[PDB]
Design a protein around this ligand. Structure first.
Ligand SMILES: [Zn+2]
Length: 257
C-alpha cells in the first residue's frame, strides 16, 4: 500500500493513482514575489465557535481530529470561496527534523510541520460527493515553526500516547480549533489537490502567511507516533509529507500587499 518509505513513497504513487502527474497537484512552492496581490479576494471567514470535535484517529499516515459535520457548525467561507464549507477533520504533516515537514514551501523554505483543516462544500451534500468536484473542498493550511509552545495544541499532544499505532482512536470532544490559528488570516490561494492518495483535484487551497509556533517538546511527541499497527515492527510516523509538485498552468494569489 502507499506510504512514505523508499519503496511506497510519493515517487511511487502515480502507479496506483495516475492523477499524481496531473495538472493541478498539491502541494506547491509558493514563490512570494510571483504571487499576485488580488484586491478582489475577500477576508477569510473562519466560524469555529460551535465546532464539535468527536474523536482522534491514527490512520497509519497521520492522526485526524474529527468533527461533527452533520450541521453548519464549523464553517469556512469568504476568502476565494463561493458558498459554505464545513469542517470535517484536521491533521498535520511533519518531519523527522525541524528543517523539514511542511508540504507547501515558501520561497523553497520548509517549515517543521503543516496543519490542514479540511472542509467540504455544502452544495455537494457529503464529503464523498464533494471530492468528485473541482470546487468540492477548501483546505486551510497553517505552517508550524519550532519556538514557543502553542498552548491550544497541548490537548492534542497529550492524547497521542493513547493512539500510538495505526487504527487506534480516542474520544476527543470539546477541542476548540480556534486555539491553532495565528493572529493574521492573510493568505495565499490556488487550485490544487489532495496531498495523499487518491490525490483528487478537488481542493481550493488557502495557505496562511503567518505560521504558528509550537515547542520542540510538542513536535517531538508527534514524532513518537507509529505508522505501524500494534505488535508490528516500530516505524516512527515522521516525514509524512509530499514534496512540492509542478505549478503548471496555475496562478497563486495573495490576499495581502
Ligand atoms: Zn494534509
Amino acid at each position: 500500500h502507499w506510504g512514505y518509505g523508499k519503496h511506497n513513497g510519493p515517487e511511487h504513487w502515480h502507479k496506483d493513482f495516475p492523477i499524481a502527474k496531473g495538472e493541478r497537484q498539491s502541494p506547491v512552492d509558493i514563490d512570494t514575489h510571483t504571487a499576485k496581490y488580488d484586491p478582489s479576494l475577500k477576508p477569510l471567514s473562519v466560524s469555529y465557535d460551535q465546532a464539535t470535535s468527536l474523536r482522534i484517529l491514527n490512520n497509519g499516515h497521520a492522526f485526524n481530529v474529527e468533527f461533527d459535520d452533520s450541521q453548519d457548525k464549523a464553517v469556512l467561507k469568504g476568502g476565494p470561496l463561493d458558498g459554505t464549507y464545513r469542517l470535517i477533520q484536521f491533521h498535520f504533516h511533519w518531519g523527522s527534523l525541524d528543517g523539514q515537514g511542511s508540504e507547501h514551501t515558501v520561497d523553497k523554505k520548509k517549515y517543521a510541520a503543516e496543519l490542514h483543516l479540511v472542509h467540504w462544500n455544502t452544495k455537494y451534500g457529503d464529503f464523498g460527493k464533494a471530492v468528485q468536484q473541482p470546487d468540492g473542498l477548501a483546505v486551510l493550511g497553517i505552517f508550524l515553526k519550532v519556538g514557543s509552545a502553542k498552548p491550544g495544541l497541548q490537548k492534542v499532544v497529550d492524547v497521542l500516547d493513547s493512539i500510538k499505532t495505526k487504527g487506534k482512536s480516542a474520544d476527543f470532544t470539546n477541542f476548540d480549533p480556534r486555539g491553532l490559528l495565528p493572529e493574521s488570516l492573510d493568505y495565499w490561494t490556488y487550485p490544487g489537490s489532495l496531498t495523499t492518495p487518491p490525490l483528487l483535484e478537488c481542493v481550493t487551497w488557502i495557505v496562511l502567511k503567518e505560521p504558528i509556533s509550537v515547542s520542540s517538546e510538542q513536535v517531538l511527541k508527534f514524532r513518537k507516533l507509529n505508522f505501524n499497527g500494534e505488535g508490528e515492527p516500530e516505524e516512527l510516523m515522521v516525514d509524512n509529507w509530499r514534496p512540492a509538485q509542478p505549478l503548471k498552468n496555475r496562478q497563486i494569489k495573495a490576499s495581502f500587499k
